[PDB]
Amino acid sequence: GPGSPHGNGLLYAGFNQDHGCFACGMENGFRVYNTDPLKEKEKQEFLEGGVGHVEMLFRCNYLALVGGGKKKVMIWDDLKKKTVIEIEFSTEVKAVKLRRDRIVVVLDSMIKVFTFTHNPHQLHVFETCYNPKGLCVLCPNSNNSLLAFPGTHTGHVQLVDLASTEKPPVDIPAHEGVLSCIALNLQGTRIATASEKGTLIRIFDTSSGHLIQELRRGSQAANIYCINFNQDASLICVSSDHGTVHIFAAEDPKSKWSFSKFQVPSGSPCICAFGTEPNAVIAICADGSYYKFLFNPKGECIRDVYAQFLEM
């Protein structure tokens, strides 16, 4: 009985590519929500072993699930409502990423890439640094198969084009310190990264590896928990493990510092993404609380929605 941090069964929460849905991995299965307006869309509460990581690929009606036991990847067919592919590993799976034609499995010190077939065939293995958080982004766009992940050298990001594997990877010396957070924009053209120091968020071009914007979260260290771009990557939001969410101008900004910030009253970690409307940010906490805040560059953030999403 390892339980859950909040005693509510929630082991994992994450957004899909455009943040219109989020999924929770629970001790008894998984749950999927429409993000905004908040709506429960699927609840599986009778999956033995639970689910500790959930990846969504609704465009193909699939999810990828990591069993609570951490050694099985299960491809869930969301029309059939069942697992149709299982891959077992001899080490703990930290994350899984999907696109239409690839299953990407993130282990502690390597990333394995498979075909998305009834019998997955391993195509590539990329060594990483130790990667306990399972950092890895995979663009699902038809015309952008970017895979990016922490390189073996501390602070570096490796960028691979799964569509053109013979071209050499791009090696970004993103930070001096251990990487803690990596995020991809919706177009797959920009990645944002933070080290465990968490004072500076850096945005890089995914073709050249060049640094395009550095943002300052603060002068003191923080544990960065989530980063996400808005729809056109004109803004990013950044959350800490204390539940503070900063909103930055990402492109030729007035300031390197955030122009708006809010903090969820639990003081606990949240994931964050922009809502359906461009002046709103969604924050979701493992304690089961959902928040939608409005923002204005010259005003305080105000709370538009509060909900306990595990009560639908």
Distance CA 7, CA 27 (A): 10
Solving technique: X-ray
How many residues are present in the chain? 312
CA angle 165, 206, 154 (to 5 degrees): 85
Q: In units of Å, what resolution does this entry have?
A: 1.8
Distance CA 91, CA 18 (A): 30
Nearest CA to 217 out of 257, 250, 251 is that of 257
Cross-strand bridge partners of residue 235: 249
The alpha carbons of the chain give a radius of gyration, in whole angstroms, of 18
Collapsing DSSP states into helix, strand and coil, what is residue 242?
Answer: coil
Confirm if 287 and 11 have CB atoms less than 8 A apart. no
Phi, psi angles (nearest 5°) of residue 146: -60, 135
Cross-strand bridge partners of residue 300: none
84: how many CB neighbours lie within 10 A of its CB? 11
Cross-strand bridge partners of residue 290: 284, 307
Phi, psi angles (nearest 5°) of residue 111: -120, 125
How many helices (H) and strands (E) the chain has is answered by 0, 28
Alpha carbon distance, N-terminus to C-terminus of the chain: 25
The tokens for 154 are 């501390």
